């Protein structure tokens, strides 16, 4: 299936936390490695881009079939500042809209393990906008299993509506590297 | 069959791009692809053009680079133009508007993919401010021209382009290829910026010339006017005296006091009137 | 306005003499429009039994007055029988084109040596088509198909939009011979069919018989752009002046079928059909299509048609004139 | 107009069929038929004729009922002194005229 996806990665000050071996930064690097490998093993016409969610809410690499560029760019990353994630998702959606392959299904996957201090009203508003503009999102959460998990579940449900199955959430409690859960998650399972 | 009414409408951007590529690569026959659409059987818009790498020597066309062409096309589709390649253009810096053997081979290559592909030849050297030398072409078939056929259909009276030039006729026009009439698209919006060219800011509009320099210029010009007045007195004297050669062979190689005096009066009067008006307008507005 | 007033006064005065000069009265009525007055005068002639002059006036009316004026007079007469029928035949073309056709058939002092020399000199398709047009011009009503019967190979040489020109020349030479239409085009490709329809229109130029309905049916059933172009040309040529809503609708549909070849003919045919009409609806539609479409051929056709749709209407055109000029 | 508009489409060159107006005078009786009348013109038979088709000189000509009459060779057109037919509309006007008949 033709898929144009971007990985939003939260790189806040909290991503020097060591709850995932060795540190959340390396766990995130492994997670993006495996997810991008899955994307490549899927329809090769599928393309992947990278967004970093921080005080700057920047876009590292736009849509590109190659993977070494994304891996190097994400390796050249350090944790600083706080996450916004509203900018993050909006900028990601703009990148989706401005993709060379219109036939590619729109996809955003966000690693957002962090405290999301955004009001649920704007969360649901953004969810409704995304779903009505036909972009599905598969959010991944780790670390804070309670602070924001309720908000993320509500966001995913708001995207879902009644049958919008494209929206998904995956929350993983602390443990080993964030690899086994991502492999045995519904997201990559459906790939 | 093709009609002797086909018209290639080159846009302003297309024309400017061909001319820039022309007077950037000389004498190399630089080359590019013309993007547009065959709207009908008689019209070919050329909305845009884009150059090719021009690797190494380019005195001849260079076998269009497929990878460069494809990446151009994909990125243009991404950032706008979803238009196919309607032809190829190349430069002939001072030659004229004909096609060489390599040009003919390349245009065969283009027709094989798209029978309607056009071959534009620009002449950046011979172009001048108001008439750009440019011509569109497609090749006549050896098969038909040996088997007695005219490879153009004369439904209209639009075959009066310019009485094709002797250069093109001797370089292979009307035998191996034919000329397609070229027109241009006027939007009245790009023309506004093209007019904004040569425009001067109100600073320059209202600036007064350095008064010392102005006075020195007036002094000098009046001095040449004095000398030319002496020479004008001399010339008018020995003008009616004899006119066997006065008609044409009495001013060649020699100064014309009347002409130079007219030039001096014109220039100095323009300068002085303009500066007086500027000074007065300034004295009032900047009060 | 003042010219109309002077014509009214002059007509009233002419209707006061010991020898009422009805030829000048009918000229005044022609220049005045107002066909009801001439229809009443014509019925008065019929009642008075002045067949000679009452028939001269009808010849003059057919010669000068427009098709719409003639149709208005005909319908007014609708609302003895043999005189009425002869008069209606004369007014509505019947026998009026036949007289000229017979005259020109017998008086056909053509000189084919000139064209033999020309065709000896012909060397290219342009000159071939030019000679075809010249032959058509020299024949016109005279139906002498001399060359087009003698030299089949020379005619067959030219193809593409040259079959169309040759068939249009057939129409020209057969002009006025409206009796044998269809039966006569049975003699003779999309180019050939389009040229045949154009020839039918040319033969029935400004004479709206059942050939208009035939052309309507054939254009509705047309499949190729060339045949649609020929059918539109012929239909408009036949229905010039006769502003008919069905003809307008078919031609507008053909035009909106955005093909340059058929679009030019559709625009020209709309102009021909609605000549002098000046209906805001068709004027607006044609101008809008001209400003919207992107086919220079269709633009040329629509330009000619917009020029033709206002053949009269001398002064009350300045708005459209200014808009077009700007 | 349409003929002049032939540059953009030659086939439109045939529209001069409309402009071709037969220059003739035709005499019709009360029966809408062509009597074998003979019109008379006081014009030399060199000022008006087809040249070189492929008494010293008279000032007299005669034409049959269908008559080739041009605007120049129409004002001098007339009919014999006495005839069975008399042109109701003056011949100088031209066109197709009607002929009032004598007793027979």
Q: Between chain B and chain D, how many beta carbons pairs sit less than 8 Å apart?
A: 15
| Entry field: residues in chain D | 104
Cα of C261 to nearest chain B Cα, Å: 9
Cβ distance of D10 and B154 shorter than 8 Å: yes
DSSP state of C16: T
DSSP chain B: --BTT-EEEE-HHHHHHHHHHHTTS-SS--EEEEEEE--SSSEEEEEEEEE----S--SS-----HHHHHHHHHHHHHTS---EEEEEEEE-TTT-S---HHHHHHHHHHHHH-TT-EEEEE-TTT-BTTB--EEEEEEPPHHHHHTT--SSB-SSS---SSS--HHHHHHTBTTTEEEEEEEE---SSHHHHHHHTT---HHHHHPPPPHHHHHHHHHHHHHHHHHHHHHHHHHHHHHHS--SSTTTSSSTTS--HHHHHHHHHHHHHHHHHHHHHHHHHHHHH--
Interchain contact C119–B (C-beta under 8 A): no
Instruction: Output the six-digit token pair for D72.
Output: 């120049």
Instruction: Output the six-digit token pair for C190.
Output: 């999309």
Q: Are C255 and C292 in contact (CB under 8 A)?
A: no
Spell out which residues of chain B touch residue C125, defining contact as CB-CB under 8 Å.
150, 153-154
| Separation CA D12–CA C305 (nearest Å) | 13
Breaks (C-N over 2.5 A) in chain D follow: 54
**H/E segment holding residue C297:** helix C296-308
**H/E segment holding residue D78:** strand D77-78
- Residue B172 to residues B142, B178, B186: CA-CA distances in angstroms? 12, 9, 32
B90 is in an annotated binding site: yes
Q: Which residues contact C220 (CB under 8 A, 6 or more apart)?
A: C250
Q: Are C60 and C27 in contact (CB under 8 A)?
A: yes
Half-sphere exposure of C42 (CA within 13 A, CB side): 31
Q: Are B132 and B167 in contact (CB under 8 A)?
A: no
- Residue B62 to residues B31, B89, B157: CA-CA distances in angstroms? 8, 12, 37
Spell out which residues of chain B touch residue D9, defining contact as CB-CB under 8 Å.
155-156
| Separation CA C173–CA C108 (nearest Å) | 12
**H/E segment holding residue C125:** helix C125-139
Residue with tokens 């899955």: A38
Burial code (b: 16+ CB inside 10 Å, e: under 16) for A56-69 equals ebebbbebeeeeee
Where are chain B's structural domains?
Answer: 7-195, 206-280
- Alpha-carbon Rg for chain B, nearest whole angstrom, is 28
| Separation CA C200–CA C231 (nearest Å) | 9
Nearest to C251 by CA among C237, C230, C269: C269
Nearest to C231 by CA among C200, C197, C183, C265: C197
Q: Which residues contact C290 (CB under 8 A, 6 or more apart)?
A: C298, C299, C302, C303, C306
- Residue C35 to residues C28, C32, C58, C81, C315: CA-CA distances in angstroms? 11, 8, 13, 21, 22
D29 preceded by cis ω (within 30°)? no
Interchain contact B39–C (C-beta under 8 A): yes
Q: Are B26 and B180 in contact (CB under 8 A)?
A: no
Q: Are A88 and A110 in contact (CB under 8 A)?
A: yes
Structural resolution in Å? 2.9
Instruction: Output the six-digit token pair for A174.
Output: 């602390």
| Entry field: residues in chain C | 326
B217 is in an annotated binding site: no
- Alpha-carbon Rg for chain D, nearest whole angstrom, is 18
Where are chain A's structural domains?
Answer: 2-185
* Beta-carbon count within 10 A of A113 CB: 31
Spell out which residues of chain C touch residue D68, defining contact as CB-CB under 8 Å.
107
Q: Which residue of C has its CA nearest to D100?
A: C52
DSSP state of A162: T
Nearest to D15 by CA among A44, B9, C199: C199
B103 is in an annotated binding site: yes
Residue with tokens 């700057």: A56
| Separation CA B202–CA C70 (nearest Å) | 69
- Pairing, β B118-122 against β D85-87: unpaired
Q: Which residue of B has its CA nearest to C295?
A: B40
| Separation CA C243–CA C239 (nearest Å) | 7
| Separation CA C139–CA A65 (nearest Å) | 74
* Beta-carbon count within 10 A of A55 CB: 12
Chain A residues whose C-beta sits inside 8 Å of any chain B C-beta: 100
Q: Which residue of C has its CA nearest to D89?
A: C56
Q: Which residue of B has its CA nearest to A97?
A: B78
| Separation CA C99–CA D65 (nearest Å) | 11
| Separation CA B98–CA D80 (nearest Å) | 73
Cβ distance of D8 and C95 shorter than 8 Å: no
List chains adjacent to chain B, taking adjacency as at least 3 C-beta pairs closer than 8 Å: A, C, D
| Separation CA C29–CA C77 (nearest Å) | 16
CB-CB: which of D11, D22, D98 is closest to C56?
Answer: D98
Cα of B78 to nearest chain A Cα, Å: 5
Which segments of C49-124 does DSSP mark as H helices, in order? Answer: 51-64, 67-78, 81-91, 96-106, 112-121
Q: Which residue of B has its CA nearest to A99?
A: B78
Chains C and A are touching, with contact defined as 3 or more CB–CB pairs separated by less than 8 Å: no
Angle formed by the axes of helices C245-256 and C260-273, nearest 10°: 160
* Beta-carbon count within 10 A of B233 CB: 10
| Separation CA C251–CA C200 (nearest Å) | 17
Q: Counting Cβ atoms within 10 Å, is residue C1 exposed (0-12), middle (13-18) or buried (19+)?
A: exposed
Q: How far does chain A reach from its first CA to its final CA, in angstroms?
A: 9
| Separation CA A166–CA A163 (nearest Å) | 9
Instruction: Output the six-digit token pair for B245.
Output: 């050669």
DSSP state of D2: T
| Separation CA C23–CA C39 (nearest Å) | 14
- Residue C306 to residues C63, C115, C302, D1: CA-CA distances in angstroms? 26, 37, 6, 13
Cβ distance of C295 and B41 shorter than 8 Å: no
| Entry field: residues in chain B | 287
DSSP A77-135: ----S----HHHHHHHHHHHHT-S-TTSEEEEEEE--S-----HHHHHHHHHHHHHTT-
| Separation CA A115–CA A13 (nearest Å) | 11
Cβ distance of C111 and D88 shorter than 8 Å: no
Instruction: Output the six-digit token pair for B147.
Output: 């088997």
Instruction: Output the six-digit token pair for C37.
Output: 């007055």
């Amino acid at each position: 299936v033709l898929e144009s996806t971007m990985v939003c990665v939260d790189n806040s000050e909290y991503m020097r936390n060591g709850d995932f071996l060795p540190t959340r930064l390396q766990a995130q690097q492994d997670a993006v490695n495996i997810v991008c490998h899955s994307k490549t093993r899927s329809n090769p016409e599928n393309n992947v881009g990278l967004i970093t969610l921080a005080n700057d809410c920047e876009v590292l690499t736009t849509l590109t079939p190659d993977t070494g560029r994304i891996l190097s760019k994400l390796h050249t990353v350090q944790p600083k500042g706080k996450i916004t994630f509203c900018t993050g998702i909006r900028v990601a959606h703009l990148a989706l809209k401005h993709r060379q392959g219109k036939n590619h299904k729109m996809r955003i996957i966000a690693f957002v393990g962090s405290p999301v201090e955004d009001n649920e009203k704007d969360l649901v508003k953004l969810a409704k906008r995304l779903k009505k503009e036909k972009v599905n999102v598969d959010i991944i959460n780790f670390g804070e299993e309670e602070v924001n998990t309720e908000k993320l579940t509500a966001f995913v449900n708001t995207l879902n509506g009644k049958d919008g199955t494209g929206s998904h959430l995956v929350t993983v409690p602390p443990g080993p590297s964030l690899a086994d859960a991502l492999i045995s998650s519904p997201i990559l399972a459906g790939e | 069959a093709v009609d002797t009414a086909e018209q290639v409408y080159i846009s302003s951007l297309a024309l400017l791009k061909m001319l820039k590529h022309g007077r950037a690569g000389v004498p190399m026959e630089v080359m590019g692809l013309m993007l547009g659409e065959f709207v009908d059987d008689y019209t070919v818009r050329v909305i845009d053009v884009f150059a090719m790498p021009q690797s190494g020597t380019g005195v001849s066309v260079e076998a269009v680079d497929p990878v460069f062409q494809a990446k151009m096309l994909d990125m243009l589709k991404q950032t706008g133009r979803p238009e196919m390649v309607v032809g190829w253009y190349h430069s002939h810096p001072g030659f004229g508007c004909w096609l060489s053997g390599v040009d003919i081979n390349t245009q065969q290559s283009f027709e094989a993919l798209s029978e309607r592909a056009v071959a534009v030849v620009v002449d950046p050297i011979q172009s001048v401010k108001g008439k750009v030398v440019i011509d569109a072409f497609r090749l006549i078939n050896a098969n038909m021209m040996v088997l007695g056929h005219e490879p153009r259909q004369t439904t209209s009276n639009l075959g009066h382009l310019n009485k094709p030039s002797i250069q093109a006729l001797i370089h292979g026009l009307n035998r191996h290829y034919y000329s397609i009439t070229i027109n241009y698209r006027k939007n009245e919006l790009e023309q506004k910026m093209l007019l904004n060219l040569h425009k001067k800011s109100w600073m320059e509009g209202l600036t007064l010339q350095d008064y010392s320099e102005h006075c020195k210029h007036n002094e000098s010009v009046v001095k040449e006017m004095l000398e030319l007045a002496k020479n004008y007195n001399k010339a008018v004297e020995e003008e009616d005296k004899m006119t066997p050669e006065q008609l044409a062979i009495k001013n060649v190689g020699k100064q014309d006091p009347k002409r130079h005096l007219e030039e001096h009066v014109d220039v100095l009067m323009t300068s002085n009137i303009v500066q007086c008006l500027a000074a007065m307008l300034d004295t009032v507005v900047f009060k | 306005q003042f010219r109309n007033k002077v014509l009214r006064v002059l007509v009233k005065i002419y209707m006061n003499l010991e020898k009422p000069d009805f030829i000048n009265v009918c000229q005044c009525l022609i220049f005045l429009d107002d066909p009801q007055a001439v229809s009443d005068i014509l019925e008065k002639l019929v009642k008075e039994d002045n067949l000679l002059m009452a028939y001269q006036i009808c010849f003059d009316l057919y010669e000068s007055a427009s098709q719409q004026f003639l149709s208005s007079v005909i319908q007014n007469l609708r609302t003895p029988k043999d005189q009425t029928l002869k008069m209606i035949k004369i007014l509505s073309g019947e026998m009026a084109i036949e007289l000229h056709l017979q005259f020109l058939i017998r008086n056909n002092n053509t000189d084919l040596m000139i064209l033999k020399n020309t065709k000896d000199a012909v060397r290219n398709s342009v000159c071939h088509t030019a000679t075809v047009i010249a032959n058509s011009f020299m024949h016109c009503g005279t139906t002498s198909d001399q060359f087009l019967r003698d030299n089949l190979e020379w005619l067959a040489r030219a193809t593409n939009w040259a079959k169309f020109t040759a068939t249009a020349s057939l129409g020209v030479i057969h002009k006025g011979h409206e009796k044998e239409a269809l039966q006569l085009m049975a003699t003779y490709s999309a180019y050939q069919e389009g040229g045949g329809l154009y020839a039918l229109g040319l033969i029935h130029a400004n004479h709206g018989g059942d050939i208009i309905d035939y052309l309507l049916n054939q254009l509705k059933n047309a499949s190729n752009d060339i045949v649609r172009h020929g059918g539109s040309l012929g239909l408009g040529l036949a229905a010039m002046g006769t502003a008919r809503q069905d003809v307008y609708d078919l031609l507008k549909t053909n035009l909106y079928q955005d093909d340059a070849v058929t679009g030019e003919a559709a625009g020209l045919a709309l102009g021909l059909v609605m000549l002098g009409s000046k209906n805001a609806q068709a004027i607006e539609d044609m101008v809008g299509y001209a400003q919207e479409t992107q086919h220079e051929k269709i633009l040329r056709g629509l330009a000619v048609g917009i020029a033709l749709v206002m053949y009269g209407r001398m002064e009350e055109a300045d708005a459209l004139i200014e808009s077009l000029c700007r | 107009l349409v003929f002049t508009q032939f540059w953009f489409w030659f086939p439109l060159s045939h529209f001069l069929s409309l402009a071709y107006t037969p220059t003739c005078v035709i005499g019709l009786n009360k029966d809408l038929k062509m009597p074998k009348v003979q019109y008379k013109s006081n014009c030399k038979p060199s000022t008006f004729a087809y040249p070189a088709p492929l008494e010293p000189e008279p000032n007299f000509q005669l034409l049959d009922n269908p008559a080739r009459v041009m605007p120049a060779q129409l004002k001098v057109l007339t009919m014999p002194e006495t005839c069975r037919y008399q042109p109701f509309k003056p011949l100088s006007i031209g066109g197709i005229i009607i002929l009032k008949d004598t007793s027979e």
